[PDB]
Symmetry: C2
Subunit: 290 residues, 2 copies
Amino acid sequence: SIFPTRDSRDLSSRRRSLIDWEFPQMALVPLDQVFDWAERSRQSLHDDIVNMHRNLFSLEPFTAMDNAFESVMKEMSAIQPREFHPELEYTQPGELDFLKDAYEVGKDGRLHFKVYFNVKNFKAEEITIKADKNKLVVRAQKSESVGRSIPLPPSVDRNHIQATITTDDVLVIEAPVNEPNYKAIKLSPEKGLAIQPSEVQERQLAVKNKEGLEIVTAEDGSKKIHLELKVDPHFAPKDVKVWAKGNKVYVHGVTREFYKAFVTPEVVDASKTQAEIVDGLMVVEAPLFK
Amino acid sequence: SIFPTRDSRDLSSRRRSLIDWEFPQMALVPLDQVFDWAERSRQSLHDDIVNMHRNLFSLEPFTAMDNAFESVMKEMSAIQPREFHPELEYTQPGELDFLKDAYEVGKDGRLHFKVYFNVKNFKAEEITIKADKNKLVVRAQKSVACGDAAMSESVGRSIPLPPSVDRNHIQATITTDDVLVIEAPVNEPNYKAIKLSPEKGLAIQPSEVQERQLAVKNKEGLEIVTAEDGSKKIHLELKVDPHFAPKDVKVWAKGNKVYVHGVTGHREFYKAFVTPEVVDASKTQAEIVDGLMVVEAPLFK
């Protein structure tokens, strides 16, 4: 048997404390997604492993490799933001397209950024890893250093980056993502990480009567894309998915069907994307980084 | 500038381990469900609190109250399981109907069993709480006067306590406005299928699976299946029109009664069944694959 304890608040207030509480699952990938992901992942386990090894980032002559990376970023920043036919333009795989598949749930249930490097013939002591601004750098030294530099979205937690080399020589680098849009996340094999718009009563994303792509300035100087699309009212939230492929944003609805796409001069921080479709007008916003 | 550590596993071993992992959220109420709950809960906090106070369990002369409880459970055990019209029969409030709303998310994100008791005129130290078999027992008792050992007659209240509720983690708290709150998490409820709503309380949404996990005894209707060990569960089979998608059907309990509702587009149906024992609702399972829905839920007395 046991004895109760006195509280300090009435019923009402104790129930209010519960109502406004920060439940753990609000900071974890939704159960349905994790379940579906786990299910299909074991069915393709053997092939996915084979493909992972087949697509490991290789380490190349550092200096040359790093400049090539800088020119890519530099060139990209010269793109003029515009809309394009998703099925006709940019159909060729792009340099930053791997970011689409860099997100995966971790054992802690949170969303994580994970990338894989081939480090065969190198020892852990010969490998350094740095995160400066929005680029991750892997450098190995035996004669000159070899390495790899890649975009590292701002949302990836720099204080919790982990790095281990498997027995089959795969450098794994991962870190959780801070504050991704958990409620809207959809994990799919194709799109990788997409978000589903929410039907709201009170919009949280400012409408601006500007139909199309815009690129504004977040509440702190940084940039972010703003899209306004007029879509048939016969489209429900569950019929629409927004996703990113490097510096490109794709929107696809099917119930009736549409497919839009936009290229920008910066990389899209996908897991932080937000979309609210209501009254035939869907507005998408997502942070951008370079 | 960090340096990597060498692991003891190969890549595929690590992956297989992640895939079969027991993710935290697989033991928590689904995010959307919690979100929607809190959303509408604040929208109706006032009224909800009114009704709660108006429906608090009271403590009564212990011996009498306990006899009454055994009586009610005895009468119930004599019920002949059968289907009944959900809108025209068992329309009056029942003794175990509170169970439909005893389920609620807790701060730890798990599904909890929560019951409230009016405990005015009692100090937290005068109240005792214990779990005996499948019943929750609350007993209070105060002295008659200061300086004398004599006690007043014990008052109390006993209620059905589903087997799934965790006996080792019961917590009891008395508010400032005299409402004894008793909570406890539920062990392994059907988290993925849970649908919370004020009207149905805790409902289950059947799943469309390729591999039927529940048995098909090829016979429509309700059936009380008894296992070698003595355990009992309800097994319900229903042929439903193919136009009904899993998301169009909901199953839920109200004490010793089970309700099934389906509506799509435009067609709908509404069936109900009464049993001689209490349903352990959160443990309910339902799968509807190609016209045949099967529902199984543990029974208990």
